[PDB]
Design an enzyme around this catalytic site. Sequence first.
Site: not given
Lengths: 141, 141, 141, 141
Positions: A10, A50, A58, A86, A92, A106, A116, A119, A130
Amino acid sequence: AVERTLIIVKPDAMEKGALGKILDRFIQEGFQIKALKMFRFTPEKAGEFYYVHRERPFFQELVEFMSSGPVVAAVLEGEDAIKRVREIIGPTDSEEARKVAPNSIRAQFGTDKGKNAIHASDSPESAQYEICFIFSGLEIV
Amino acid sequence: AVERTLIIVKPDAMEKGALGKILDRFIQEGFQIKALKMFRFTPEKAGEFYYVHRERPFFQELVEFMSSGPVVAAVLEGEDAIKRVREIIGPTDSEEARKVAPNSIRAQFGTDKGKNAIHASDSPESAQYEICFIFSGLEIV
Amino acid sequence: AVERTLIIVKPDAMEKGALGKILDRFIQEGFQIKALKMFRFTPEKAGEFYYVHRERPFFQELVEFMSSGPVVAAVLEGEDAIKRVREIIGPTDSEEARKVAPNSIRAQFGTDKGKNAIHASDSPESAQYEICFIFSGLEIV
Amino acid sequence: AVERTLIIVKPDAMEKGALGKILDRFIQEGFQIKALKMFRFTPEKAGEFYYVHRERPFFQELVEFMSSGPVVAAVLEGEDAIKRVREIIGPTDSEEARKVAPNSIRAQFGTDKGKNAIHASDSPESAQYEICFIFSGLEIV
């Protein structure tokens, strides 16, 4: 079995200069990078990417942030990749990550719940969606 | 319902200068072009794209031909697009297309069974696979 | 000598369903299409692409229009392509094109001075810049 | 002045898992990454990319190696970037790099003269050509 999953670095992690460290982490974890590119979501595309969260509170903040600057996506391949990736990135909320998963991406590079750092696809179904959203079969090499 | 399907204009039709006429036909038939690009299959990628036919006798010829020169792919969107586009292109054998579907793309621009001008997805499942193989969500606009 | 030039089919011509006819015209005129893709300018990118006109009064209108919807770009190759393609598209003002170049692309598909169907590189220098802006060497096939 | 240059992480460095460390080095050196992608040269494209060396004795070996597996290209931007990046990667012969430039990328990740981890543009002219060969203006963000 061997699986593919998507990560996106990000804008916050990009700005912090964390890109190399983040990729290196996944390399050391034993994943193959099958696709990789820097690009920029338009607000519309981020919204589509998304779509599942369009109803959530959010949503607008997420869409704006994820279109606020360039990002880097990668396809990671390896045994049990979706579940493993993950766990590597951690919860998150970056602050909670530092509390419960101090070695997670993170925890190391995330600031809070919105900035954060990264993704990752959360399921086989979402991974399939995705990956295709970002990369064509022609880009997977 | 509104559907998306993939077409690929093959090297033979490309060489014949049929590209514009072929796209025009689909436009006149009322389809939206959602993605479009000229590219070239490597033999490996063409093999992957046609994975379902790996066992068939024609496989190697098909893979070689489809990687013998540049091709153009498009995503077509419209009501019942998958079945309608199949009907518009006509039977695989160009010669038979001229016999039973004289207004079909293959009748107009195809030569024989191998040089048959154009490819189209043959089912919802194959459409989903083929579109993602060639175009990412980022390229669908 | 053999040259390469860029065209872009604008949102107005796209909406009119003129894409196939426009490409066909250039094919009939004897050009090779070396690259082709549908994409969408962000306002920022359209601004960059048209940097030379940033001072002009029409600039903002141009940038907004050229980012108002998807467009299709092609690289055209042929003898004296840059000057020949300019002449084929005709004067910028579609209405004037109908008066002085009735067979030009803009006469056929253009509406006025802004919605004028198509863009083409206006010089060797601008051709070099424009082609690279839209297509990498990897996309020229 | 502020300049852009191209690097390519070669198949040997890719296989060694050096990608993250290599990008991190350039980030620490204060460069902005403006474009980034994993792709694979066809032998033809690698030949075109390296056209200046077509006469050289090493040409065929270079072209084969550079098309033997996926690579990663990046555009690096910064003050005096072209000259600085050259110096950072070090001499072409990895072994000589360890002898005379022990902190260079090639000293750290290169094996010999052929498997030397990384490519970088050697001049303003070559930078302009190389960047355009790999990335369009649309991919620079």
